[PDB]
Amino acid sequence: KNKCVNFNFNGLKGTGVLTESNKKFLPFQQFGRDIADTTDAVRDPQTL
Amino acid sequence: QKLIANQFNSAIGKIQDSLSSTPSALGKLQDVVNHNAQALNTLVKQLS
Numbered sequence: 001k002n003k004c005v006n007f008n009f010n011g012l013k014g015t016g017v018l019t020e021s022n023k024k025f026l027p028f029q030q031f032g033r034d035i036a037d038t039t040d041a042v043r044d045p046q047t048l
Numbered sequence: 049q050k051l052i053a054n055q056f057n058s059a060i061g062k063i064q065d066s067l068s069s070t071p072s073a074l075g076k077l078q079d080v081v082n083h084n085a086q087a088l089n090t091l092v093k094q095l096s
Contacts, residue, residue, distance in 0.1 A: 030074060035093060036092055036095040036096050037095075037096035038095070
C-alpha cells in the first residue's frame with residue numbers, strides 16, 4: 001500500500017497506488033468506476 | 049457643474065446596483081468558462 005506498484009486483481013491489470021477507501025460498497029458490488037468508466041476502487045480477494 | 053456632478057454620481061451608484069442585482073450581465077464571460085469546462089469534460093467522457 002501507498003506505493004506505486006503494478007497490480008493484478010482477478011485479471012484486472014493496472015499500475016497505480018493503493019490506499020484505503022471510504023466507499024461504502026454494497027455486499028454484491030465488487031469494484032467501482034469513475035466518470036471515464038476506468039476502475040477507481042476494487043475489493044481485494046482473500047481480505048474483502 | 050454641481051448638477052452634472054450629481055448626475056454622474058447617481059449614475060455610478062445605479063450602475064453598481066444594477067450589476068449587483070442582474071445575474072445575466074456577466075453572461076459572456078460565464079459562457080467562456082462554461083464552454084471550456086464542457087469541452088474538457090466531454091473529452092474526458094469520450095474515453096469510455
